[PDB]
Structure formats: structure tokens, C-alpha cells
């Protein structure tokens, strides 16, 4: 008699004559909000700042900074495999990501499955030297080996022109994969979208938190020229993440265990 229902449900007389009266107020959002938010798939298509990247921290001389990043944003807190290092509760040090908690990072570990394309923007703010004509470029990796989040510099200021060309051929920009380029002095914004290519895969594990140490199959290499002179020390790249149009999440299996804390002192 509806007595061990896994979803419950047995309505007993409560304190209202009219059942659900706020659905009968048609012109409610002409008075208070101006808009109504019904789905998360509509709200996941607002871009949000994830993380910044400084190209004059890897090599020396005039070189070509390359960054292998996952297509899905990395997660916010105390990783065991984090790209930064914070001061923990034992007055020591531990790996930590100083990235933001996006809505995609929030919603994804509560679902089983995940599939879809993912959109990025690379903004290139900061300072720069007056002698730059660099090209910012995004190029996708293969879908067999997920590369972790890594940073590499390719030197371009050799005496041999062939040993410069051999450094430009160590790059994913030289490959048959999809490449988007732009000049930094004229547009400085990529606005790319990573499609969901797969080796016969219908989805992947949406509850996979270790993106900075493993990566996923939608990784992208971001490449930008940098020189070793001053005022390029403040040259950086800002990543804005969002969600493509064929994106979906699987079955909801409950919220994960969450943790609330501010950012520590970066050491």
C-alpha cells in the first residue's frame, strides 16, 4: 500500500487549499527577475574563467611555449597530482590547483556518463614587449593516448635555420590534426571547440577527477611565441571554458562528497 516505495510518496493533507499556486502566476518574471532558468544545459553555455598560464616560466631565449591541456577543465582543490603547491594544515606543502570551480566541474561527477564537444577561449592578457608578432595556435591531440597537463618550450633562436625547423616540427601545429591560428597583435583570441572523437567509445567516466595527471581524449595543445626580455614576465594566457552543443550527461547518481575551504597561501 505504497509503504516501501524507493522514491516515497503518500500525500497527506497540508496547509493549502490551492495546489502549487506559483505555477499559475504567468507574469511573475515580468516583475522580479526578467528571465527564467529552467535547465542546466542552457546555463552551461556561459563561459567562465578557469585558469591562467605564464609562458615566460619554462624556457630561455626566444622560444615557442606549448601547453598540453585537457579539453575538460581541471578541478579546484587539493589534488594529489596538482599543478601548483599550497601550504596545508600541517604547516607543510601539498599539491593544489589554483583554478576556479566551474559549473561543468560541479555538475560532472554527479553523473555517470559524459559525451560532447567542449568550447574554449584563450584571451592573452597582461603586458608584452613592443617587438612581438606572435601567432597563438590551438591544435588537437589524438584520441588514443591522453596526455597530462604539461608545459614545454621549443627554442627558435638557434644559429642554424634547420635546427629551428626541427623545433617547429616537434610541435602538434605541424600535423594533420585540426589547427586554429590567430595573430596576437590583431585578434589575440582563439574561440575553439574540441569535438568528441573516440576509439569506439559511447561515453567516458564523468566521475574522473584526475585530469591534471592523466588528461582526457579531448586534449589540446596551445602554442605561443615568447621572448626572454622583461615586460613579457606579465604576458599570460587566460582560459575560458564552456560546453558545445552536442553535450550531454548520463544518469544522476547523487551529489559527490563536497569540501568547503578557501585557497591557501601558495608555496
Amino acid at each position: 500500500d505504497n509503504s516501501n516505495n524507493p522514491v516515497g510518496g503518500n500525500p497527506i493533507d497540508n496547509y493549502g487549499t490551492e495546489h502549487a499556486p506559483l505555477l499559475k502566476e504567468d507574469n511573475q518574471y515580468l516583475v522580479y527577475q526578467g528571465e527564467r532558468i529552467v535547465s542546466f544545459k542552457d546555463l552551461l553555455r556561459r563561459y567562465q574563467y578557469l585558469n591562467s598560464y605564464w609562458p615566460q616560466e619554462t624556457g630561455s631565449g626566444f622560444r615557442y611555449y606549448t601547453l598540453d591541456s585537457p579539453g575538460m577543465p581541471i578541478y579546484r582543490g587539493w589534488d594529489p597530482n596538482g599543478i601548483d603547491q599550497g601550504q596545508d594544515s600541517t604547516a607543510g606543502n601539498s599539491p593544489y590547483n589554483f583554478c576556479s570551480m566551474t559549473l561543468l566541474n560541479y555538475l560532472a561527477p554527479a553523473f555517470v556518463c559524459q559525451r560532447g564537444s567542449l568550447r574554449h577561449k584563450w584571451v592573452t592578457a597582461g603586458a608584452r614587449v613592443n617587438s612581438t608578432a606572435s601567432v597563438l595556435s590551438a591544435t588537437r591531440h589524438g584520441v588514443l593516448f591522453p596526455l597530462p597537463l604539461a608545459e614545454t618550450a621549443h627554442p627558435l633562436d638557434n644559429a642554424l635555420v634547420g635546427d629551428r625547423r626541427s623545433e617547429l616540427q616537434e610541435m602538434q601545429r605541424s600535423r594533420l590534426n585540426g589547427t586554429a591560428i590567430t595573430p596576437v597583435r590583431l585578434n589575440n583570441t582563439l574561440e575553439i571547440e574540441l569535438p568528441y572523437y573516440s576509439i569506439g567509445q559511447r561515453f567516458h567516466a564523468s566521475r574522473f577527477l584526475d585530469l591534471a595527471g592523466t588528461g582526457d581524449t579531448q586534449g589540446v595543445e596551445i602554442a605561443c611565441e615568447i621572448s626572454d626580455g622583461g615586460n613579457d614576465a606579465n604576458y599570460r594566457l587566460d582560459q575560458f571554458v564552456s560546453v558545445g552543443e552536442d553535450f550531454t550527461l548520463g544518469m544522476f547518481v547523487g551529489a559527490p562528497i563536497m569540501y568547503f575551504y578557501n585557497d591557501p597561501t601558495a608555496t
Binding site: 505555477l23 527564467r36 552543443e245
Partner: protein, 51 residues
């Protein structure tokens, strides 16, 4: 779908008095995309669900 100036022809954000069908569930046809699909196959107001 991919059409020229599609944001003008939406109700796009809001009340749109007949858009108080927020209590309706979206039905997805068995191989439906998001673009050239259910935003025209459910109704006019299927763009508040993100389609």
C-alpha cells in the same frame, strides 16, 4: 538550426506568456541532435530548456 539571425526570432530569455510550460518534460526523438531538432519539434518555447 544554423540560420541567419536566429536570436531575433526567439523569445530567448523570459516570460513569453505562453512559455509557462516549464512543468513539461522535453522529449528527445531516438537519434535527435540538438541543433536541427526538438527546438522545432516540441514547440516554440523549447529554447528555455537550452535547445
Amino acid at each position: 538550426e544554423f540560420k541567419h539571425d536566429g536570436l531575433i526570432s526567439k523569445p530567448a530569455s523570459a516570460v513569453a506568456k505562453a512559455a509557462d510550460a516549464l512543468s513539461m518534460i522535453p522529449y528527445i526523438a531516438p537519434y535527435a541532435k540538438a541543433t536541427s531538432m526538438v527546438a522545432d519539434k516540441i514547440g516554440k518555447i523549447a529554447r528555455i530548456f537550452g535547445y
